[PDB]
RNA sequence: UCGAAGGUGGGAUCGGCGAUUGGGACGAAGUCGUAACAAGGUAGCCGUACCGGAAGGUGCGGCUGGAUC
RNA sequence: CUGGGCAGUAACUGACGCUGAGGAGCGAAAGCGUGGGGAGCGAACAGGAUUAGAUACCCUGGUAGUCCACGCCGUAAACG
RNA sequence: AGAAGCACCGGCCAACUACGUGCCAGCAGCCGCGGUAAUACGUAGGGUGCGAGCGUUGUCCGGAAUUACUGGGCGUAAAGAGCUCGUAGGUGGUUUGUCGCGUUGUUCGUGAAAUCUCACGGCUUAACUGUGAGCGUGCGGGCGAUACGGGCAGACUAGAGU
RNA sequence: CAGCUUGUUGGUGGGGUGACGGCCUACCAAGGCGACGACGGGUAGCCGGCCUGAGAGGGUGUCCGGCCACACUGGGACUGA
């Protein structure tokens, strides 16, 4: 558009969006647990969702997914959140990393099992 | 690391002999597996795919390892195909199997390996040495009178010797004329492919 | 023995009193290997009908494609519907570097060193279209000079004069 | 208003070479009486000529078409703007076409191609690519 | 401002991005001896020592003066 | 004389909290209408005014992205 | 009383041209201020009918406003 | 003889069957999969990609010609100010002469070393390392060119005004 | 963030310094910067380089090497090339 346009007003590309907040530069962060519950997905894709509202050590409060079946988080257990956003929740972009200070490894995994943390055999 | 595994399983996938004459290849031309003689799907990438895995096994050449040799193909002047192949050739133990002391490619890789070569007067046990022009290939003087040895001595007849190295007499030394252009090459892959898999 | 490549199927459809009537088309490309091309729509009931239509229309369609010895003679760039294909020769070591729906033209056509990009839409019965719309702006260095009235030798550069000669000696 | 005399040029050779008109008409001065002899030298056009208009002097251009109707000139293009101007070194001479083209570069020893610029060492500014 | 005169420079210079030649001024402070400089005249300088705290010009001549 | 920290004073600027309150988004298979899409049952939208549970209704001017002969 | 446009003559000046960030002026209708005027039409309003309801359509009435003077508003599907 | 694991196997994207499960348990980057025959969930077999590593997350560039100078748009998709007048700014018709600021040629000074590309050499190869040459897009000083842009001093009537 | 500046912009006579200089001081003149972004607010050590990219660009300043700034916070001189 007018070369002389573009030495008055020059071109500026668009501002990116921060795509994952409350971890502020860290690829993981832990935090403190409270309100071990379980949440409802959207209108297709009924199911019963296991979740956690971890209030991280950035002083925020976030909402993470367990993932894998079975799980012993009550109150104050100290989990470590990863990045990562569950789809059919509508507000969770965190995930529990399984195989951490205070979340078990999911049992008699014998596929894949790096994730979800599992030794191998004993 | 190296393979260390089966060797027509990975000649029946990419559904050429890799090796030299195989009894257990063309008895099943086809893929291994349970889902062996099912029709596959040839996709672009495929064929992409599986014309660089010919010419991993041909060598046993790792993939951080084949990929730096790209790097440097890519780089020089001619062209990108005849020169990965040249620079995969000149390997010390791609030498010894085209002198025709070695019956495969996996003792060829061994006899480098343990230590039974010099080349300079230099004891060698690499087998990614790449030799230059008019390097002497030497067996060690201890390493005569050995079974591995003596075997490729009435045997240097059935397999051609390439035109750009040359083997002679009592002294099992082999010497090294030129870096090898395209046409004493040995063909069961064809070469664009390898360098349109890394352009995606 | 010509090369042919189905690029794509889609099951179109068309909706009527009772309920849907559906269709197959396959975009089918034929070329000689050497220096011809020919683009075929072709569509019916059934799939491998439909790509029976596809190569007889293409073997119909035939265009000359100017070479010099595995690569083009300059770049151009076509326009389709709203497709746009930029054509760029290469060195001869390099191979075909184009997207899915322009190789299927480059590698029949005998083009062993191009380096293609999509610029417009990214469907892929316009990105054959626009592909052989820029084959169609490529001219021969032996037919710009009938059109200048000069030699070969001031109207091509020093380059693929001598790049010419490499291939049939 | 006018500006760009030499775009001007360019525009109506192409809007008669797209048309198949035998010849144009325009108004004369000397930038553009010395584009013209490039483009015959080249053989884009055939021979021009001088007339005498009402005020000032007229630049008629014959055109040249082959057994067929098939176009001489396969396009034109003004690459120095008036809002934007290209000039370029003896070592990055413009290269139009692959070399089957020809830029009317603008040298301080008159208007040379790019062949004639290289081998005579000089730069200068790139009037048009005409191709 | 009493033996010291303004003189408003201007540069011509390639755009590092867009490549169109940009015109820009400027505005420096030059000595007199003798206070004989209206508003106009075409002047020629030469830099010296620092002369003040934003002075390091000096008037050489004029041509083609105030009209 | 100048002078860091300290003391008093009225302003500037950026954030947290706040009884109560304005709207926005999304939730389920809630309640009351039927405004728009067909001439959507009174042709629709635009600016402005006043009015009405809610959509919206009517005035004045305008558009065809509506008609009519 | 006054602005612009077009054609012809080619008498005259001799590039005085084009566009124009900010800015300034003009700018349908509704509306707003002070004072006039008010036939007809007609938001709000009221009654009647229609209807499950009818704060609407249709009907009889009918205030602001529509009109004039001097200011403000500065918005329209201000559109090709 | 003392020495192999890890992810993945619906499409993208190389690689599929059986059993358990029955909108549950759970998967997932996207759109989607699971409601009694699931190549998408859990396991086993098989397979593919790598391999002393393999995967996940965080971050940046690419793909994105989705800030477009190279390289885009604006009747109806997002986008022409309601319309004109005018300030700074950007831009300028034909022609003669001149200065040589832009532009361009050439040469000396500078652009440290390392890194980077090329070519050889030395560590058993390689990473790494040494040497030689390019690179360092520039900037300053001297000497050439005047076609084009511009500055200065004139001329002309086609644009503009009277 | 649209008006900032009074030793502020300039001159003369002194003082000061290794040295030019409102650097400091007394008087005199009334200037200096700004829509080409002054004054203000947010952030940041800078570069050779590093990563990506076909290039142009985009992100970055970590090892190594050059330069700058600071040494519990804020100020101040002394000794000496
Ligand atoms: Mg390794
Ligand atoms: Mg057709
Ligand atoms: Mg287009
Ligand atoms: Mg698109
Ligand atoms: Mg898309
Ligand atoms: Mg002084
Ligand atoms: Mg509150
Ligand atoms: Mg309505
Ligand atoms: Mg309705
Ligand atoms: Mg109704
Ligand atoms: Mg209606
Ligand atoms: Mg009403
Ligand atoms: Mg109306
Ligand atoms: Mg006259
Ligand atoms: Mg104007
Ligand atoms: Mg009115
Ligand atoms: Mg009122
Ligand atoms: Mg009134
Ligand atoms: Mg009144
Ligand atoms: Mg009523
Ligand atoms: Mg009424
Ligand atoms: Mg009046
Ligand atoms: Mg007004
Ligand atoms: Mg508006
Ligand atoms: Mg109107
Ligand atoms: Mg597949
Ligand atoms: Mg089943
Ligand atoms: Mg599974
Ligand atoms: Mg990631
Ligand atoms: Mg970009
Ligand atoms: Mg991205
Ligand atoms: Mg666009
Ligand atoms: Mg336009
Ligand atoms: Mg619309
Ligand atoms: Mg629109
Ligand atoms: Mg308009
Ligand atoms: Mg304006
Ligand atoms: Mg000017
Ligand atoms: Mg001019
Ligand atoms: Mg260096
Ligand atoms: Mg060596
Ligand atoms: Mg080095
Ligand atoms: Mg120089
Ligand atoms: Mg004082
Ligand atoms: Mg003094
Ligand atoms: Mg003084
Ligand atoms: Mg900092
Ligand atoms: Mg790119
Ligand atoms: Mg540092
Ligand atoms: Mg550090
Ligand atoms: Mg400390
Ligand atoms: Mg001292």
Redesign the interface.
């Known amino acids: 558009p007018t070369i002389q346009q573009l030495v008055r007003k020059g071109r500026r590309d668009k501002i990116s969006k921060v795509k994952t907040a409350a971890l502020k530069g860290s690829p993981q962060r832990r935090g403190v647990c409270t309100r071990v519950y379980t949440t409802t997905p959207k209108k297709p894709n009924s199911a019963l969702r296991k979740v956690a509202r971890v209030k991280l050590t950035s002083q925020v409060e976030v909402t993470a997914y367990i993932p894998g079946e079975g799980h012993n988080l009550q109150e104050h257990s100290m989990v470590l959140v990863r990045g990562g956003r569950v789809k059919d929740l509508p507000g969770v972009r965190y995930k529990i990393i399984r195989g951490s200070l205070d979340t078990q490894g999911v049992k008699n995994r014998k596929q894949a099992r790096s994730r979800y943390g599992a030794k191998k055999e004993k | 690391a190296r393979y260390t595994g089966p060797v027509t399983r990975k000649s029946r996938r990419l559904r050429t002999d890799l090796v030299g004459g195989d009894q257990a290849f063309e008895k099943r031309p086809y893929p291994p597996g349970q889902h062996g003689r099912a029709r596959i799907k040839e996709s672009?990438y495929l064929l992409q795919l599986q014309e660089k895995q010919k010419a991993r096994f041909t060598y046993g050449v790792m993939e951080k390892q084949f990929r730096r040799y790209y790097e440097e193909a890519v780089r020089q002047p001619?062209?990108?195909?005849?020169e990965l192949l040249k620079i995969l050739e000149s390997r010390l133990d791609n030498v010894i199997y085209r002198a025709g002391l070695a019956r495969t490619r996996r003792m060829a890789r061994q006899l480098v390996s343990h230590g039974h070569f010099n080349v300079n007067g230099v004891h060698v046990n690499v087998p990614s040495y790449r030799v230059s022009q008019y390097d002497i290939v030497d067996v060690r003087d201890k390493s005569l009178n050995t079974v591995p040895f003596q075997i490729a001595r009435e045997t240097a007849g059935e397999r051609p010797i390439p035109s750009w190295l040359q083997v002679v007499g009592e002294r099992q030394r082999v010497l090294i004329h030129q870096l090898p252009e395209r046409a004493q090459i040995d063909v069961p892959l064809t070469e664009?492919?390898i360098?349109?898999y890394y352009?995606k | 023995n010509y090369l042919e490549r189905v690029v794509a199927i889609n099951r179109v459809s068309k909706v009527v009193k009772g309920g849907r009537r559906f269709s197959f088309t396959a975009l089918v490309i034929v070329g000689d290997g050497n220096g011809m091309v020919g683009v075929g729509y072709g569509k019916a009931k059934e799939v491998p009908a439909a790509i029976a239509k596809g190569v007889e229309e293409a073997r119909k369609s035939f265009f000359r494609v100017p070479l010099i010895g595995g690569t083009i003679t300059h770049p151009v760039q076509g326009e389709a519907a709203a497709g746009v294909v930029l054509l760029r020769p290469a060195s001869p070591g390099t191979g075909v570097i184009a997207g899915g729906a322009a190789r299927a033209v480059l590698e029949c056509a005998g083009v062993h060193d191009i380096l293609a990009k999509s610029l417009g839409s990214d469907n892929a019965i316009n990105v054959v279209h626009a592909t052989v719309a820029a084959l169609k702006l490529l001219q021969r260095p032996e037919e710009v000079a009938a059109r200048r009235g000069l030699p070969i030798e001031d109207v091509a550069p020093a380059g693929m004069l001598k790049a010419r000669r490499k291939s049939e000696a | 208003t006018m500006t760009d005399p030499i775009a001007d040029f360019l525009t109506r050779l192409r809007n008669a070479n797209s048309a198949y008109h035998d010849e144009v008409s325009l108004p004369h001065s000397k930038l553009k009486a010395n584009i013209a002899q490039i483009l015959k030298n080249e053989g884009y056009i055939s021979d021009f000529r001088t007339e005498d208009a009402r005020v000032g002097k007229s630049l008629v251009i014959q055109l040249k078409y082959g057994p067929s109707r098939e176009r001489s000139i396969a396009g034109l293009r003004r690459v120095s703007k008036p809002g934007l101007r290209v000039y370029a070194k003896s070592t990055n001479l413009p290269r139009v076409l692959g070399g089957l083209g020809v830029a009317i570069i603008s040298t301080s020893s008159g208007l040379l191609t790019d062949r004639q610029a290289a081998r005579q060492g000089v730069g200068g500014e790139v009037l048009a690519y005409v191709w | 401002m009493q033996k010291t005169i303004v003189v408003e420079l201007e540069d011509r210079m390639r755009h590092p991005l867009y490549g169109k030649i940009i015109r820009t001024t400027k505005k420096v402070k030059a000595h007199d001896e003798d206070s004989v400089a209206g508003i106009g005249d075409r002047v020629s300088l030469m830099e010296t020592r620092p002369l003040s705290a934003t002075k390091r010009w000096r008037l050489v001549e004029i041509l083609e003066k105030a009209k």
């Open positions: 672009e001619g062209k990108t195909g005849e664009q492919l360098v349109e352009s």
